[PDB]
Design a protein around this ligand. Structure first.
Ligand SMILES: *[C@@H]1O[C@H](CO)[C@@H](O[C@@H]2O[C@H](CO)[C@@H](O)[C@H](O)[C@H]2NC(C)=O)[C@H](O)[C@H]1NC(C)=O
Ligand SMILES: CC(=O)N[C@@H]1[C@@H](O)[C@H](O)[C@@H](CO)O[C@H]1O
Ligand SMILES: *[C@@H]1O[C@H](CO)[C@@H](O)[C@H](O)[C@H]1NC(C)=O
Ligand SMILES: *[C@@H]1O[C@H](CO)[C@@H](O)[C@H](O)[C@H]1NC(C)=O
Ligand SMILES: *[C@@H]1O[C@H](CO)[C@@H](O)[C@H](O)[C@H]1NC(C)=O
Lengths: 49, 295, 291, 49, 49
């Protein structure tokens, strides 16, 4: 039970924004210029780490 | 030892946009004879047309072009829905007051933007059009009201405000204000009082069947191969396959537990496809030590 | 034009119970075999909804408030209820919204109407069942929005048998958009008009950018006038059996369950009980022994 | 304190033309060291208001 | 001793800004416009987590 629960929690934490405008990387890269997309992607990367 | 992961690479790229022919009526908006007053601003619906970004840059100088939630450069690579255009005219001093979250006469009594606004604001100076030598008085505004407006609301009612107590009840004497005023636009006031033309475009993205989207060409559709797909601006990489699901008419995408798209409606033939990562792996290498062999 | 319709009695408001009714699809995404938690304006479970009858002759159509939204349901048989008016004063001094259904097609207008004392509809010509008279407003001077939907054909049929039409609507007004959700159901009633138990989800229908301030509303009814209705426009009319219920939305948090095909089949109101609070914290519909 | 309670509500007011502060929150907003010009002009000079 | 000390540290850790302009939520919300107040608030939230 402990193993299955831990893995499911890890899989489900992927649908969080961490302050960014979206939880999808491709969508952040679209509709934004690089020097602004870098901040959002930084947020996402730190959260998942 | 564990070294790396093997990974199949994509073969080709495809694109799938809807087929619409006519251009959008951006002419009627930016080239109107006269603009409406800020207290009775206008709103027009733009739908079912191919948008464009070059024609603006091609016509008269349109400075102060600032957007929220999307960069101005990328507007031609996207696919929209529910596009609306609000146009009006103000003095050149108050153009800073058009932003999400602000204070001042216009923001509180004439035109409020929602705090989560996504869209673009355009403003440019117009003296050869709106200012006349004796001063144009057809452009009015509102100065008095009990409480602030909620986002995207208008008030055309005209009645005497009662600043103090003991309402005067339609005699319009002092201790009572007529809530509407007028701008003086003599072509001599200076930069800080010229009449400026403002247009606000609003829309929302990538969550419903779209009708206004930019100029791009469609490619044929290929199934059962690791490819680079792009459906209405939703880029991705993987394998596509015909589905068994059953979408309701107002749905276009489908999501899974991790909140990642894994089904999509093809916007030319109206069929449902399923998206899957193409390959994964782990590689481990067994060696007897380089002191013994190199095999 | 406007006539004064007297000869209808005064009775106190009747109340009934909402057995988990008034839930709608909150988004436009497909989901299946999942439990999803959402926060919005819903109708609380087991609420008291006001109950009106059109059966003296009991013509109740008062001017009701509009706090944050409205759940409107109507059990009927012959299409007596047709539409609604929304506004703040309704006296030509402020804008007001109008939704009507003629015998042909839907009409939506946001104009400075001057609504007179009693709006209604007439004719119901004997043996022909045709609609000809339209008595709602007196003038509509300044306005900006207008819409006439697709043409359809209302049979304008009368009915007195077992009720078979239950239509549910949800009305919301936020950020300049007026949102409508709807659902239909054929029901066997056999019983004293008490809002059958069950579960059913409403689906989005229309979104309108009207942009007005709304505080009150009221219902439009068509009236039955023929030979068995002796009298003029004030007395010579028939009722026809109909009933409708009104409830108000409030900000809640709900837990929803999608089956494998993608339809909402169950729900949990997280502010109803302590046990609902427990389920809504655990994100499950079942709980085991403990604290 | 700059209480204008018996100012905004006075009848004999003809020209209170205030260009950066709405006359309601005069009290809800502060200022700094105050310096008031009291003098007279004629009607042919109310242009100067 | 160990338990008491750990709790004291945890509690007193609530008066740090972690780089934001202030440690009071209402002070951050006012005095700033939303789209940049939110980054300060997220800074505080990450620190406390
Ligand atoms: C219900 O209202 C609609 C909207 O006004 C009516 O349809 C229009 O009627 C006018 C009346 O002359 C015509 O000029 C329009 O051409 C009609 N609109 C169309 C055909 O799209 C409708 O007729 C009304 N119902 C009845 C029974 O008359
Ligand atoms: C939530 C709720 O039911 N509130 C009240 C109920 O307590 C009361 O009994 C009823 C009148 O009968 O009016 C309603
Ligand atoms: C809407 O109308 C009510 C009643 O007239 C009023 O109190 C309220 O302030 C109005 N809404 C706004 C945003 O002013
Ligand atoms: C409203 O109607 C009145 C009377 O017809 C008119 O004087 C006024 O200009 C109108 N207002 C607008 C905003 O059209
Ligand atoms: C779902 O769809 C399948 C296939 O159409 C059908 O057999 C089934 O009855 C539907 N309902 C449920 C609850 O599975």
């Amino acid at each position: 039970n402990h193993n299955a629960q831990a893995l499911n929690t890890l899989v489900k934490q992927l649908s969080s924004k961490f302050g960014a405008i979206s939880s999808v990387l491709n969508d952040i890269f679209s509709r934004l210029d690089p020097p602004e997309a870098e901040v959002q992607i930084d947020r996402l990367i730190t959260g998942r780490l | 030892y564990q070294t790396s992961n093997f990974r199949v690479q994509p073969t080709e790229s495809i694109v799938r946009f809807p087929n619409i022919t006519n251009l959008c009526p951006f002419d009627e908006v930016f080239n109107a004879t006269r603009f409406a007053s800020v207290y009775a601003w206008n709103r027009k619906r733009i739908s079912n047309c191919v948008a464009d970004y070059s024609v603006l840059y091609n016509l008269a100088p349109f400075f102060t072009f600032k957007c929220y939630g999307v960069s101005p450069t990328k507007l031609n690579d996207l696919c929209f829905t529910n596009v609306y255009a609000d146009s009006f005219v103000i003095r050149g001093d108050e153009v800073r007051q058009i932003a999400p979250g602000q204070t001042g006469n216009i923001a509180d009594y004439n035109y409020k933007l929602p705090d989560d606004f996504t869209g673009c604001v355009i403003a440019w100076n117009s003296n050869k059009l709106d200012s006349k030598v004796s001063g144009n008085y057809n452009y009015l505004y509102r100065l008095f009201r009990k409480s602030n407006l909620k986002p995207f609301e208008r008030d055309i009612s005209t009645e005497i405000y009662q600043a103090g107590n003991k309402p005067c009840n339609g005699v319009a004497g002092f201790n009572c204000y007529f809530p509407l005023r007028s701008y003086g636009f003599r072509p001599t006031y200076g930069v800080g009082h010229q009449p400026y033309r403002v247009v606000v475009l609003s829309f929302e993205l990538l969550h419903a069947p779209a009708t206004v989207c930019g100029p791009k060409k469609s490619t044929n559709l290929v199934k059962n191969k690791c490819v680079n797909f792009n459906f209405n601006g939703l880029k991705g990489t993987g394998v596509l396959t015909e589905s068994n699901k059953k979408f309701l008419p107002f749905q276009q995408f489908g999501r899974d537990i991790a909140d990642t798209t894994d089904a999509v409606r093809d916007p030319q033939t109206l069929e449902i496809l399923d998206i899957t990562p193409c390959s994964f792996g782990g590689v481990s290498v067994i060696t007897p030590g380089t002191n013994t062999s190199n095999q | 034009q406007c006539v004064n319709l007297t000869t209808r009695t005064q009775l106190p408001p009747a109340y009934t119970n909402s057995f988990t009714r008034g839930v709608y699809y909150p988004d436009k995404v497909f989901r299946s075999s999942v439990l999803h938690s959402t926060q919005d304006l819903f109708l609380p479970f087991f609420s008291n909804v006001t109950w009106f009858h059109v059966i003296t002759k009991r013509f109740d159509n008062p001017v009701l408030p509009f706090n944050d939204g409205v759940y409107f349901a109507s059990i009927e048989k012959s299409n007596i209820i047709r539409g609604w008016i929304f506004g703040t004063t309704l006296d030509s001094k402020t804008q007001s919204l109008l939704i009507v259904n003629n015998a042909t097609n839907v009409v939506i207008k946001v104009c400075e109407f001057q609504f007179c004392n009693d709006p209604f509809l007439d004719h119901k010509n004997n043996k022909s069942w045709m609609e000809s008279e339209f008595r709602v407003y007196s003038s509509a001077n300044n306005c900006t929005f207008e819409y006439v939907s697709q043409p359809f054909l209302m049979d304008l049929e009368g009915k007195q048998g077992n009720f078979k039409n239950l239509r549910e609507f949800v009305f919301k007004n936020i950020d300049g958009y007026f949102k409508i959700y709807s659902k239909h159901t054929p029901i066997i009633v056999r019983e004293p008009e008490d809002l059958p138990q069950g579960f059913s989800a409403l689906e989005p229908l229309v979104d309108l950018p009207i942009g007005i301030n709304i505080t009150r509303f009221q219902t439009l009814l068509a009236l039955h006038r023929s030979y068995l209705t002796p009298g003029d426009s004030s007395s010579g009319w028939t009722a026809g059996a109909a009933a409708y219920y009104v409830g108000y939305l409030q900000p809640r948090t709900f837990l929803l369950k999608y089956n494998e095909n993608g339809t909402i089949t169950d729900a949990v109101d997280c502010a109803l009980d302590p046990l609902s609070e427990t389920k809504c914290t655990l994100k499950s519909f079942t709980v085991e022994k403990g604290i």
